[PDB]
C-alpha cells in the first residue's frame, strides 16, 4: 500500500446511497486528540455497503482502515474521504461496557 489510513473514533450520521452508479454507505467518524476531526468514510460494494448500513450504529466506536481519496468536486459542469472496500479496507466495531 502507497495509501493507508487508520482512524479510531465515534460514528455519526450513517446513511446509504449511490455516489455515481456504486452503492455507498457513508458515515462520519470523529477522531479526538488532546483536536477533533470529522472524517467522511465511504464503504463501497452492494453487499459491504449494506452490511455497514445494517449493523453499524450512531455512537459506535470503530476502527477504520482505508485509503485517503480526494474527489475535487467544487466545479460541475466530501472533497476528502476514506474509501473502505474489502479486501483493501475494513470497519471494526469495538464493543464493551455495561
Amino acid at each position, epitope marked *: 500500500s502507497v495509501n493507508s489510513v487508520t482512524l479510531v473514533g465515534v460514528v455519526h450520521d450513517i446513511q446509504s446511497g449511490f455516489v455515481y452508479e456504486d452503492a455507498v454507505t457513508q458515515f462520519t467518524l470523529t477522531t479526538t486528540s488532546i483536536e477533533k476531526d470529522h472524517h467522511t468514510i465511504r464503504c463501497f460494494g452492494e453487499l*459491504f455497503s449494506a452490511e455497514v448500513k445494517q*449493523k453499524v450504529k450512531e455512537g459506535n466506536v470503530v476502527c477504520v482502515n482505508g485509503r485517503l481519496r480526494l474527489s475535487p468536486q467544487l466545479e460541475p459542469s466530501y472533497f476528502p474521504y476514506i474509501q473502505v472496500q474489502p479486501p483493501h479496507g475494513q470497519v471494526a466495531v469495538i464493543h464493551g461496557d455495561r
Partner: nanobody, 119 residues
C-alpha cells in the same frame, strides 16, 4: 454443522489459531462469530465478521490482541489469538447466522466448542 479446532493448552504471553470449518448451509452469505465461556460465567462475545469480511466486531477485552478472518473458499472462520492471558481461559464456540446484533449470543448455528486454557 460447524466444527472448531486449534484449541489447546498454552502459557501466558502465548498465541493460538482457532479455526471453524462450516457447511455450505451455515456459512454461505452468513455472518460468523466467536464466543467464549469462562468458568463461572455466562458465555460472552469475542469477535464476529460479516459475509464480505469487510465488517468486523471485537469485544473491548480482546481488541488489538485477537484478529478474526474468514475464507469463503474453504468455508472457514479463523481467530488468531495473540498475547494470551489466564483470563482468556474458556471454551470457545464458533457460531453462524446471527438472529440480531452480531455481539449477542443469539445465532441459528453453534459449534460444540474447543478448550483454550492459558496457564
Amino acid at each position: 454443522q460447524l466444527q472448531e479446532s486449534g484449541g489447546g493448552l498454552v502459557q501466558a504471553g502465548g498465541s493460538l489459531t482457532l479455526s471453524c470449518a462450516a457447511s455450505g448451509r451455515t456459512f454461505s452469505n452468513n455472518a460468523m462469530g466467536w464466543f467464549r465461556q469462562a468458568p463461572g460465567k455466562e458465555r460472552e462475545f469475542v469477535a464476529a465478521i460479516s459475509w464480505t469480511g469487510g465488517l468486523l466486531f471485537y469485544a473491548d477485552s480482546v481488541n488489538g490482541r485477537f484478529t478474526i478472518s474468514r475464507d469463503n473458499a474453504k468455508r472457514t472462520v479463523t481467530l488468531q489469538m495473540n498475547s494470551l492471558k489466564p483470563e482468556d481461559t474458556a471454551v470457545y464456540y464458533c457460531a453462524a447466522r446471527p438472529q440480531g446484533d452480531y455481539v449477542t449470543a443469539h445465532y441459528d448455528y453453534w459449534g460444540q466448542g474447543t478448550q483454550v486454557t492459558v496457564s
